[PDB]
Amino acid sequence: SIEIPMDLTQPPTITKQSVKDHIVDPRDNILIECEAKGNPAPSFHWTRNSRFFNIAKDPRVSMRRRSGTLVIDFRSGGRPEEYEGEYQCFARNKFGTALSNRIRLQVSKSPLWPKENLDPVVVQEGAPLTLQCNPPPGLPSPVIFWMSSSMEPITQDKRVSQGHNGDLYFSNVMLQDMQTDYSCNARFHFTHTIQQKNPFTLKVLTNNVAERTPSFMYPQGTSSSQMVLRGMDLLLECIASGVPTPDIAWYKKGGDLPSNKAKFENFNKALRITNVSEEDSGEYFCLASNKMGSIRHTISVRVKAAPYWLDEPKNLILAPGEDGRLVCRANGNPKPTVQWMVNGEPLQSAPPNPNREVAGDTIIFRDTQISSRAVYQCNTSNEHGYLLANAFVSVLDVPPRMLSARNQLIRVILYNRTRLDCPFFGSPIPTLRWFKNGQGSNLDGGNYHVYENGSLEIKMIRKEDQGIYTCVATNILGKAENQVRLEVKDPTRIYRMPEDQVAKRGTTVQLECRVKHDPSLKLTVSWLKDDEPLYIGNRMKKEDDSLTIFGVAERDQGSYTCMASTELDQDLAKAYLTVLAD
Amino acid sequence: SIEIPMDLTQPPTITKQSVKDHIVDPRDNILIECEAKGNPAPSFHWTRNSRFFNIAKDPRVSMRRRSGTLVIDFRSGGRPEEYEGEYQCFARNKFGTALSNRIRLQVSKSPLWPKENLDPVVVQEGAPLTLQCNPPPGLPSPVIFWMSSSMEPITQDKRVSQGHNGDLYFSNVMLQDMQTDYSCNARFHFTHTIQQKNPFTLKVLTNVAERTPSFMYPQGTSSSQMVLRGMDLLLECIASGVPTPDIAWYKKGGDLPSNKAKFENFNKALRITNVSEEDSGEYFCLASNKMGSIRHTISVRVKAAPYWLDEPKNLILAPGEDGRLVCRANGNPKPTVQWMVNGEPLQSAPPNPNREVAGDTIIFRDTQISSRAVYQCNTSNEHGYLLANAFVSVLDVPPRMLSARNQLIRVILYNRTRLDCPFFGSPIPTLRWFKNGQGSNLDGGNYHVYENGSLEIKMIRKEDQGIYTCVATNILGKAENQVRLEVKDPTRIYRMPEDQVAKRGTTVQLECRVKHDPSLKLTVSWLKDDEPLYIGNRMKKEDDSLTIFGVAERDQGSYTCMASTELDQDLAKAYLTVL
Ligand SMILES: *[C@@H]1O[C@H](CO)[C@@H](O[C@@H]2O[C@H](CO)[C@@H](O[C@@H]3O[C@H](CO[C@H]4O[C@H](CO)[C@@H](O)[C@H](O[C@H]5O[C@H](CO)[C@@H](O)[C@H](O)[C@@H]5O)[C@@H]4O)[C@@H](O)[C@H](O[C@H]4O[C@H](CO)[C@@H](O)[C@H](O)[C@@H]4O[C@H]4O[C@H](CO)[C@@H](O)[C@H](O)[C@@H]4O)[C@@H]3O)[C@H](O)[C@H]2NC(C)=O)[C@H](O)[C@H]1NC(C)=O
Ligand SMILES: *[C@@H]1O[C@H](CO)[C@@H](O[C@@H]2O[C@H](CO)[C@@H](O[C@@H]3O[C@H](CO[C@H]4O[C@H](CO)[C@@H](O)[C@H](O[C@H]5O[C@H](CO)[C@@H](O)[C@H](O)[C@@H]5O)[C@@H]4O)[C@@H](O)[C@H](O[C@H]4O[C@H](CO)[C@@H](O)[C@H](O)[C@@H]4O[C@H]4O[C@H](CO)[C@@H](O)[C@H](O)[C@@H]4O)[C@@H]3O)[C@H](O)[C@H]2NC(C)=O)[C@H](O)[C@H]1NC(C)=O
Ligand SMILES: *[C@@H]1O[C@H](CO)[C@@H](O[C@@H]2O[C@H](CO)[C@@H](O[C@@H]3O[C@H](CO[C@H]4O[C@H](CO)[C@@H](O)[C@H](O)[C@@H]4O)[C@@H](O)[C@H](O[C@H]4O[C@H](CO)[C@@H](O)[C@H](O)[C@@H]4O)[C@@H]3O)[C@H](O)[C@H]2NC(C)=O)[C@H](O)[C@H]1NC(C)=O
Ligand SMILES: *[C@@H]1O[C@H](CO)[C@@H](O[C@@H]2O[C@H](CO)[C@@H](O[C@@H]3O[C@H](CO)[C@@H](O)[C@H](O[C@H]4O[C@H](CO)[C@@H](O)[C@H](O)[C@@H]4O)[C@@H]3O)[C@H](O)[C@H]2NC(C)=O)[C@H](O)[C@H]1NC(C)=O
Ligand SMILES: *[C@@H]1O[C@H](CO)[C@@H](O[C@@H]2O[C@H](CO)[C@@H](O[C@@H]3O[C@H](CO)[C@@H](O)[C@H](O)[C@@H]3O)[C@H](O)[C@H]2NC(C)=O)[C@H](O)[C@H]1NC(C)=O
Ligand SMILES: *[C@@H]1O[C@H](CO)[C@@H](O[C@@H]2O[C@H](CO)[C@@H](O[C@@H]3O[C@H](CO)[C@@H](O)[C@H](O)[C@@H]3O)[C@H](O)[C@H]2NC(C)=O)[C@H](O)[C@H]1NC(C)=O
C-alpha cells in the first residue's frame, strides 16, 4: 500500500484495533482498542450488537483522547460478564468513514459443575467401560484431567485413557481399577481455576476372562467424517475395546502422513496434524490390531478454508481526472462472496457516483474528481469466516515530495548486495529513476533493481559502483531529487588460513590467520574451539597473525575456527587438529 | 415437650425451618423453609432485615401453600447474592404467633486470587522463611494446600510445613527447596472449586553456622486464645533453627487428656477435639534444639454458647390450674433471658393478672381460657443465643387414646419388646399398665415405663404372653387400650452341619435341622462362603439338609445355613474340604 503524509487532506485509516475473538479475564478492566489517523481530526463512535452504543449514558465506559479506544473500569462496581457481545468501531471525518472488524468480546468464565448425583458403577471384569466427563464450557475449552477425589494421581495407559472430549475409556476393566475413584477435573485457562465433577466409584464382578475381538468405543459405525479449517489443528481419535488391549495404527489412503506436521498422542490413539492444508484432505483409517483380530475404521477428512488475501485492496492515490481501480480478491473454500460498502453504507444504496462502475469484485473509477473521495470497505465472507478491508480514494494536487533525509551515506563491502532507500510521494504517483555520477542513463536492468517504493537494490557490487546516486521522482506537477553516497570498502579476506594437522602429545602447534581488510575499518579476530568461543589461557599464545598451543593433548583435539570481522564484513576459517595417542 | 392432637384448638408450632447460618449455592433457586402447625390453619409472614418482607411486590419470591416456606426463582433473571440478609418467619393464628430463628441467608463464595505479580523470593541458606498465602475470604472456609504450578505435590516434614492460617513455614531453608515452585491452593467443598495462587519462586544464597531456636508463628513469649465449648482447640508453635528443632507440648499443673488431645503437623500443632470448661488453663510449648530450648505459653479460656439445662415445654392445663414455664440455659458468660408474648416484648405486652414473671421462670396461677398464647424465650450471650417457643393451652377434653385399639404384637422368646401407648389429656393424665387383669401396676424389674407412655419389657419369658392393658386417667375421666403379646418359640438349629473332608465324585451332605414355632413361616437358605445361594445345578436343597454332587475345587470353603422367620434368625457354619 501507499500512505499519505498527514499534512495533506486524508480520509481516516485504522492503525490498531482489538482482535476478532477478544477473550478477557473476569478480573481485569476491559479495553477495546480502536485508533485511527486522519488529516482532519477523526471522531469515533461504536455499535454494540448492530445498534448504536452510547458512551455518555454509561459512566463506566470512557473513550481515550484522539482515538476510539474504550476503557471500562469496574472499581466503582459491575461485572464484565454484562458487556459480552459484538462491538464495531467507526472512524469518521469530513472525507469519509472507516470501519473496524467486529470484535466478539467474551469473558473467560469458570462455571461450576452442574449438580448431579452419580450412582455406583458396576461392571463385569474384562468388559469395556466409558466414564463420560461432560465438562462445563469455557473459553478456551478447559483442560480435562482425571484424579481421585482425594487428588491422588490416576495413571493412564494404552488400556485406560481419556479422549479429547475428556471421557475416560477402559478397553477392558480389571480388578486393580478399583484402587481409586475417578473424578473429572477441568482447569480453566485465564483463572487457573479447577472445577471437580463428583467422583465415580467402580464395582467389578469376576467371571462366573475369555478373549474377545477388538471393537471401537468412541467412533461409532464403520466410517465417519470430520471438517477442519485451513491452518487449524486436525485431531483424529480411535479407541478400541478388547480383552487383549488393542494397538491402534494409523494410515492414509494414497499417501503417508507428513512427517513434519503429523504427531501421535494418547498412546497412538490420537493423530494430530498441525498446519493443515488442502493437501491434507483425504481418507484416514485406523486399525485396532490385536492378538485375536483386527478391524478398521475410516474417517473422511475434508479441509475447508476461511478467506485469505490474494490481492488486498490498496488505497487509491489519484489526481483529478485519472483512472484507477480497487481490487478485492480473497481465496477460500467455499469461495468467498464479496460485498462492497462505501463509508459503512452498502454500495447498492450509496450516493450514486457516475465515475464509479462496480463489477463482481472490482470497482473502476474513470475520470475521478474531488467527489467520491471516500473510504470503501470490502467484506469477503464464507460460512467459515470473513475478511474486512478498508481502502480510501484520495484525489489531491500536490507536487512530488521526498520523504527521506538528504545526501545520506551508505558503506558496503565489495561483493555484498545493497539497497538504497528513497521513499517519495506525489499527487499523481510520480515515476522514480536512479542515476549515477550525473549520467543520463537511468539505472535499471542487469545488476540493478527498482522497487515500487523507490528503493534500488544492487545485487553484486563492483568497485566501480562507488559514488553518488541521485533518485528523481517526477509527475506532471513537477519533480524532486535526493542524493545518497555509496562507498565500497575492501573486503576482509583471510589470505593465510589455519591448516589441518595431526600432532603427537607434547608438541607445539601453530594455526596462522592473516587477514587483509580496508584500512579505514576496525578489524577484530577471535577463535572458536569446536564451535564455541575459545578462552585464551596458559600455554596458549594469541599472536596478531597466529595462535600457538604448547603441549597439546587430547583436550585440544577438534576444530578451530578463526573469525575475522568488521562492522560490515565477516570471514571464517576452519581447521582440524588431531592429537595422537601413545 | 408434649404434643397436642390437631383436632383440638392449639396455637401454632414451628415444625421445620432453615438453619441460622444458611449458605446457598449461587446457581440453585433459594429456599427459606418455615413450616408450622395449628388447629386454625396458621398464616405466615416474613421480616427481612428486621422489616416487613412484601412477597407480592417481588415476582421471584413466592410462598408455598399452607406454609411460610419462601421459594425464590431465578429463571426469569436475578442472582441469589441480591437476596442475602436476615429473615425471620412469623406463624400466626387466632391463638398466637410463633417465631423462628433469624436465618442469615448468605451465598457461598469461592473467590479468585487478586491479580498479583509476585517477586522471586530470595533467602540465605539456613534462614527462617514464611510464605504467606493470604486467601480472599470465602464461605465456607476453604482447605488450604500447597502445590507446584505443574500440580506436583510438595513434601512437608518437621522442617517445612503449613500452619492452620495456610502460610508455609521453613524453620531453616535448604538448597533443595529451589527444586519446585510453591503455589497456594484453596479448595471449596461446597461448590467443588479449586483456586490457585500465583506460584512463588525460591532463590537461595550460599555463604552453615548453628543457631538457637526462635519462634515464628506465635510471636512473643505468651499469647492468648479463646475457644467455644464443643469446638476444636488448635494450638500451633513454629520454631526456626539451624538444627531443625522439635516442638513438645505440655500443660501447667495437669496432663493432656489422652482421649481428646492429638498431635498434628509433626508435633507442631495440638488439637483438643471436644473441648470443655476443664480443658481451659495454660498450655506451653518447648522448641527443644541442640543449641537451646525456649518456651511459649498460651492461656486457653473456654467460653460457651448457651445450651439448654431445662428447655421450656408446652404448658397443657385445665381452667383454674397452675403451671410454670422454665427457661434455663447454661453458658459462659451466663445467658441473659428475654421473654416475648406472641413475638412482642413482655415489657410492652398486654398485662395479665394470672401471669407473674421472675428471672427466667413464668408462673401462671388460676389460668383461664384467656391468655392462651405462644411465649418465646431468647437466652443470649455474646457468643450465641437460643430461641424457644412454648404455648399455654387451656382445654377440657377427657383422656384420649392415640393408638389403635386391640393391637397385636408378636415376638420370639428372648427378644426385648416395647409396647407403645400414646395418650393425651387436658390435664396431664397418669398412665398405668396391667396384665391379664392382675391389678398390680407393671413397673420395677423386667419392666420400664417412659415419659411418653411406652412400656419396655427387657427379657421376655413364656409367662409374659397375654393381654396388656394401658390406662390413662385424669379428673375428667379415663381411657384404656389393649395389646395382645404373643410369644413364639425360638428357631433353633438342633442338628448343625459339621466340618467334613470328602473326595471327588462323592455325594456330600450337610444337615441343618431347624425347630421353629408351628405358627410361623420358616425360610431356610444356604450361603457359600459369604454370598447367597444359587439353586439348581447338581445341588439339591432338602427341607432339613443340603446335598452336593460332583464336588470340585469350587466347593471347598465355608458353608452357612441360615434359618430365618419374620421374627427370628439363626446361623450355622461348617467347613468343607475336597480332595
Ligand atoms: C462480513 O460479512 C459476514 C457475512 O455476511 C458477516 O458475518 C456475519 O455476522 C453476523 C453478525 O455477527 C452473524 O449473525 C450472527 O450469527 C450468530 C450465530 O452464528 C453462529 O452460527 C452461524 C450459523 O447460523 C455461523 O455462521 C457462525 O459461525 C461464524 O462465526 C464464528 C465465530 O462467531 C466462526 O468461528 C465461524 O467460522 C463462522 O465464521 C456461528 O457459529 C447469532 O448468534 C447472532 O445473533 C446474535 O446477535 C444478533 C446481533 O448481531 C442479535 O440480533 C441476536 O438476537 C443474537 O444476540 C443475542 O445473543 C447475545 C449473546 O449471545 C445477546 O447479547 C443479545 O442481546 C441477544 O440476546 C447473529 O445472528 C452471521 O452469522 C455472520 N455470517 C455468517 C455467514 O455466519 C460479518 O459480520 C461482516 N463483517 C463486517 C465487518 O461487516
Ligand atoms: C436474641 O437476642 C440476641 C441478643 O439480643 C440477638 O442477637 C443479636 O441479634 C442482632 C440482630 O441480628 C444483632 O445485631 C446486628 O449486629 C451486627 C453487628 O454484629 C456483629 O459484630 C459484633 C461486634 O461488633 C459481633 O459480636 C457479632 O458477632 C456475634 O454474633 C454473631 C451472630 O450474629 C456470631 O456469629 C458471633 O460469633 C458473635 O456471637 C456480629 O458479627 C450489625 O451489623 C447489624 O446491623 C445490620 O443489620 C441491621 C438490620 O438487621 C441494619 O439495621 C443495620 O444497618 C446493619 O445493616 C448492614 O449490615 C448488614 C450485615 O450486618 C447488611 O446485611 C445490611 O445490608 C447493611 O449493610 C445488627 O445490628 C446483634 O449483634 C446480636 N447480638 C448478639 C450478642 O448476638 C438475637 O438475634 C435474638 N434472637 C431472636 C430470635 O430474636
Ligand atoms: C552484507 O552486509 C551486511 C550488513 O552490513 C552484513 O551483515 C552484518 O555482519 C556483521 C558481521 O558479521 C554484523 O555485525 C555483528 O552483528 C552481531 C549481531 O548483532 C545484532 O543482533 C544482536 C542480537 O543478536 C543485537 O543486539 C544487535 O543490536 C545487532 O542488531 C553482533 O553480535 C556482532 O558484535 C560484535 O561482533 C564482532 C566480534 O564477534 C566484532 O568485530 C563487532 O565489532 C561486534 O563487537 C557484530 O556487531 C552485522 O550485524 C550484520 N548486519 C546485518 C544487517 O545482518 C553481511 O555480513 C554482509 N555480507 C557479506 C559481506 O557477504
Ligand atoms: C428381635 O427383633 C429384631 C427387630 O425386629 C429383629 O431384627 C430384625 O429381624 C428381621 C427378621 O429377621 C429383619 O428383617 C430382615 O431384613 C433383611 C434386610 O435387612 C431382609 O433381607 C430379610 O428378608 C429375608 O429374611 C426373611 C425372614 O423371614 C425372609 O422371609 C425373606 O424372604 C428374606 O429371605 C428380613 O426382612 C430385620 O432386618 C432385623 N432388623 C434389622 C435392623 O436388621 C431380630 O432378628 C429379633 N431377634 C433377635 C434374636 O434379635
Ligand atoms: C522498500 O521496499 C523494500 C522491499 O520490500 C524494503 O526492503 C526490505 O526491508 C525490510 C525492513 O528493513 C527487510 O526486512 C528485514 O529482514 C531481515 C532478514 O534478512 C531481518 O533480520 C530484519 O529484522 C528485517 O525484518 C527486508 O529484508 C528488505 N527486503 C529487501 C529485498 O531488501 C525497504 O525497506 C523499503 N523501503 C522503505 C523506505 O520502505
Ligand atoms: C416413646 O419413647 C421411647 C423412648 O425413646 C421411644 O422408644 C424409642 O423409639 C425410637 C424410634 O423407633 C427407637 O430408635 C430406633 O432404634 C432402632 C434400633 O437401633 C433404629 O434402627 C431406628 O432407626 C431408630 O433409631 C429407640 O430405639 C426406642 N428406644 C427404646 C428404648 O426402645 C418410643 O418410640 C416412643 N413412642 C412413641 C409412640 O413415640
Author numbering:
A (entry chain A): 24 to 231, 250 to 623
B (entry chain B): 24 to 230, 250 to 621
Relevant lines from the article:
At the Ig4–Ig5 tip of the V-turn, neurofascin 155 N-terminal residues 23–31 wedge between these domains and interact intimately with both. The Ig4–Ig5 mediated V-turn is stabilized by extensive hydrophobic interactions, in which a central Phe466 of Ig5 is surrounded by Ile25, Ile27, Pro28 and Leu31 of the N-terminus, Ile358 and Leu437 of Ig4, and Val439, Leu444 and Ile 470 of Ig5. Conservation of the residues involved in the N-terminal, Ig4 and Ig5 interaction suggests the V-turn architecture of Ig4 and Ig5 is a shared feature of L1 family members. The 18-residue splice insert present in between domains of the Ig2–Ig3 unit in neurofascin 155, but absent in neurofascin 186, is for a large part unresolved in neurofascin 155 due to flexibility of this extended loop. At the center of the neurofascin 155 homodimerization interface, established by Ig2 domains with more modest Ig1 contributions, a super β sheet is formed by joining the G β-strands of both Ig2 domains. The dimerization interface overlaps with the binding site for contactin 1, suggesting that competition may exist between neurofascin 155 dimerization and contactin 1 binding. The Ig2–Ig3 unit combination hinges at its connections to Ig1 and Ig4 by a 17° rotation that bends the plane of the Ig1–Ig4 horseshoe. Despite the stabilizing role of the N-terminus, the Ig5–Ig6 combination swings parallel to the Ig1–Ig4 horseshoe by a 19° hinge at the Ig4–Ig5 connection. Glycans at Asn residues 316, 457 and 494 are juxtaposed in the space between the Ig1–Ig4 horseshoe and the Ig5–Ig6 combination and may limit the flexion between Ig4–Ig5 depending on the glycan composition.
Cell-surface expressed contactin 1 and neurofascin 155 control wiring of the nervous system and interact across cells to form and maintain paranodal myelin-axon junctions. Defining subfamily features are extracellular six N-terminal immunoglobulin-like domains (Ig), four fibronectin type III domains (FnIII) and posttranslational modifications, i.e., N-glycosylation at multiple sites and a C-terminal glycophosphatidylinositol (GPI)-membrane anchor. To address these questions, we structurally characterized the contactin 1 and neurofascin 155 interacting regions, i.e., Ig1–Ig6, individually and in complex.
